[PDB]
Amino acid sequence: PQITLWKRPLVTIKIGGQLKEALLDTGADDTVLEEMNLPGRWKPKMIGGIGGFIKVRQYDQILIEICGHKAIGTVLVGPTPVNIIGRNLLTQIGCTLNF
Amino acid sequence: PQITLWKRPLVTIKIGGQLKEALLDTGADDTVLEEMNLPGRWKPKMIGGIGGFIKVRQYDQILIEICGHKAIGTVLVGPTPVNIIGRNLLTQIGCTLNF
Numbered sequence: 001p002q003i004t005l006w007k008r009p010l011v012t013i014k015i016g017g018q019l020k021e022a023l024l025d026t027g028a029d030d031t032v033l034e035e036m037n038l039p040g041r042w043k044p045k046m047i048g049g050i051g052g053f054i055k056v057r058q059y060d061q062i063l064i065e066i067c068g069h070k071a072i073g074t075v076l077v078g079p080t081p082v083n084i085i086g087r088n089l090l091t092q093i094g095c096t097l098n099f
Numbered sequence: 100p101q102i103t104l105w106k107r108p109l110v111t112i113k114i115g116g117q118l119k120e121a122l123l124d125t126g127a128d129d130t131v132l133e134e135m136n137l138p139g140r141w142k143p144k145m146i147g148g149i150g151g152f153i154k155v156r157q158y159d160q161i162l163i164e165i166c167g168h169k170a171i172g173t174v175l176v177g178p179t180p181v182n183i184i185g186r187n188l189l190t191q192i193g194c195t196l197n198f
């Protein structure tokens with residue numbers, strides 16, 4: 001599909017058997033999701049943006065379905081105000097910017 | 100052009116007669132540029148990111164050329180880690196997400 005940017009590019013995703021709304025964010029290097037109890041190992045990480053940094057938990061090789069397109073890679077989890085799909089997974093679903 | 104996301108979608112912009120590098124950021128509602136001098140009046144505002152809120156200077160109806168495409172809109176200036184082009188201008192250059 002094609003998504004215009006009049007509104008926030010929010011889509012439905014499926015992770016860990018749960019459905020959620022997430023922002024397709026070309027400005028986010030990596031995917032960061034709202035707090036969730038994922039199983040498996042993880043590593044502490046800090047990511048920065050406007051306002052400073054937040055501490056997150058980095059889970060590796062996590063499968064997420066974005067609009068029926070499957071994608072597997074790093075997923076960060078922490079106190080983010082929004083579910084954010086970053087470039088690490090946007091590339092796997094063939095998402096481009098066009099103008 | 101069509102822009103892949105294997106690297107950061109950075110482009111050259113021209114604002115106030117000066118060239119800069121800026122990130123096409125579909126997750127940003129507004130355009131936020133690093134500290135710089137711009138002519139005209141401005142109002143102090145605040146924007147929130149992943150790490151909290153920052154203080155910015157809001158410049159309205161600012162001419163800004165993004166990768167050869169002209170836009171005239173709101174430009175925030177403040178301590179952002181990176182020049183980001185938000186949806187308020189991405190819409191003006193006809194930018195869409197496609198997968």
Ligand SMILES: CCOP(=O)(COc1ccc(C[C@H](NC(=O)O[C@H]2CO[C@H]3OCC[C@H]32)[C@H](O)CN(C[C@@H](C)CC)S(=O)(=O)c2ccc(N)cc2)cc1)OCC
Binds near residue numbers: 124127129130148180
């Ligand atoms: C909503 C209630 O909370 P809130 O309003 C903020 O909500 C938010 C917070 C963040 C976003 C996404 C970010 N957008 C953003 O900064 O946009 C600003 C300016 O325009 C406004 O549009 C909405 C926010 C304002 C951006 O796309 C991505 N970022 C990196 C960029 C900055 C490159 C350095 S990253 O997130 O830091 C990030 C960094 C590394 C990794 N691996 C993953 C993510 C969208 C909405 O404030 C109180 C918390």
